[PDB]
């Protein structure tokens, strides 16, 4: 039984970065041979493991997170990196044994008129904890006056929408991301077997 890598990578639509989708992958034979053999990826960062022997290693538990960001913000998907994405949307643990796979996707996640359905988190009072998903839309209180659900000055929406348009620059084009958490802590996700 082969681990369903295709179910995540070749999925139809990906979730938004703030509400990233995590797929637990276990109880299967790993098949990283498809991953490195693609040459369609813009970024391929693997920490702890090199993208060569991955197919011949055993793993206790595996998590496959996925979301969509813009090109410029792909660099922030790295253990330790900081910004608005690595602090308010998706933070990786500083002991990340896994891979950070990403590829361009202006064909899928860009609507002819401009796809304003992928959203990120702009304001948040604090950084995220490792592997945190803030699905809150509470109007941001940027002062001391209580907003009480109403918009206005010092009362902003904590989520902004990606202006994904096909005319946007390379850095402003949607790049799909799949982050494989490889091992921590039985065992099942193996390679040689």
């Amino acid at each position, epitope marked *: 039984n082969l681990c369903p890598f295709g179910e995540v990578f070749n999925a139809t639509r990906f979730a938004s970065v703030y509400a990233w989708n995590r797929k637990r992958i276990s109880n299967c034979v790993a098949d990283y041979s498809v991953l490195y053999n693609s040459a369609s990826f813009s970024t391929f960062k693997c920490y702890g493991v090199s993208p060569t022997k991955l197919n011949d290693l055993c793993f206790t538990n595996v998590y496959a997170d996925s979301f969509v960001i813009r090109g*410029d913000e792909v660099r922030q998907i790295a253990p330790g990196q*900081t*910004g*608005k994405i690595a*602090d*308010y949307n998706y933070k990786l643990p500083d002991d990340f044994t896994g891979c950070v796979i990403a590829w361009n996707s202006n064909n899928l996640d860009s609507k002819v008129g401009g796809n304003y359905n992928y959203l990120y988190r*702009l*304001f*948040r*009072k*604090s*950084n*995220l904890k490792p592997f945190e998903r803030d699905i809150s839309t509470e109007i*941001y*209180q*940027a*002062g*001391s006056t209580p907003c009480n659900g109403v918009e206005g000055f*010092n009362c*902003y*929406f904590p989520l*902004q929408s990606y*202006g994904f348009q096909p005319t*946007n*620059g390379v*850095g*402003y084009q949607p790049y799909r991301v799949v982050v494989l958490s490889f091992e921590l802590l039985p065992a099942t996700v193996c390679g040689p077997k």
Partner: antibody
Amino acid sequence: EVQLLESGGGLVQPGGSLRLSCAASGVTVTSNYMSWVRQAPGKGLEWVSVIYSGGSTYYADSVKGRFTISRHNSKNTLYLQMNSLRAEDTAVYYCARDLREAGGMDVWGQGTTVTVSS
Amino acid sequence: DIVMTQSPSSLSASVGDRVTITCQASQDINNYLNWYQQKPGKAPKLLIYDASNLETGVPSRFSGSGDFTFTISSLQPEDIATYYCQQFDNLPWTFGQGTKVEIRR
């Protein structure tokens, strides 16, 4: 009620240290993007540093290893520790709240000039 | 690091005319450009944010466009200043070179 009052030093002499302040009113420092922007006596603005909300510091390259931003929400004040001060650092220093894609540095300070000379 | 080269500062327009300040950048970021107005001897005030969106207060004489442009419809005596353009690129938030508007009479 909106106001960004600044309490800064004036003279320190070269190779010295100072510490600026940004007493806020109408905003809140601990939950906002706060940045410092200085204008040298050459009528040109320059970005200095930022602290974000969740505590991530980013500085310009010219003041990377010398300057440091801190905050105390106890007094709702913002600071800029200017250690190892130089000479071109002479400028009027402004603090502002950069809302980025929802307004940009909507509220500004008033200006506290820092002069460095022997 | 980005380099935004604004238009020259020798603008001697008249009252009721216009201004057209252009802010070209090195590496173009999208909709991430702010316009400010540093009145003579005062802290910078914000006018245009996100390339074109106006701020509460700024008169309907000010306008922008998304390599970038700034425009005043009917130049009024109050608009004496040095207009800068900002950009959220990648820490540093590079500023402009300063375009000084000068009202003639």
